[PDB]
């Protein structure tokens, strides 16, 4: 037989396999971009969707 889900039944199980990251996910290398503006505001194509 296959093992019964722990959440299926009313017993309390005080040991479980907790998935976890090996280290902090906040490395500190936050993403940064180079925004570069339109050259002429008049020249922008607002049109077409």
């Amino acid at each position: 037989q296959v093992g019964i889900p722990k959440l299926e039944v009313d017993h309390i199980s005080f040991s479980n396999v907790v998935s976890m990251m090996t280290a902090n996910i906040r490395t500190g290398d936050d993403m940064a971009v180079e925004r570069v503006n339109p050259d002429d505001v008049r020249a922008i194509n607002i049109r077409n969707a």
Binding site: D39, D40, V41, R42
Partner: protein, 49 residues
């Protein structure tokens, strides 16, 4: 003798600075006449032509 190169320029003596023209660059260049809107500074310069 020794004239390296001989060009046919617009006459500065006639198109004087009183005309607002600046011929030293080899083209007429009148500042602040047909200046474009909505562009970064220095983008006006071609219109001086």
């Amino acid at each position: 003798y020794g004239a390296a190169v001989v060009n046919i320029d617009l006459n500065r003596d006639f198109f004087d600075t009183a005309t607002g023209i600046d011929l030293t660059k080899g083209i007429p260049l009148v500042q602040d006449l047909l200046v474009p809107i909505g562009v970064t500074a220095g983008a006006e310069q071609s219109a001086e032509y």
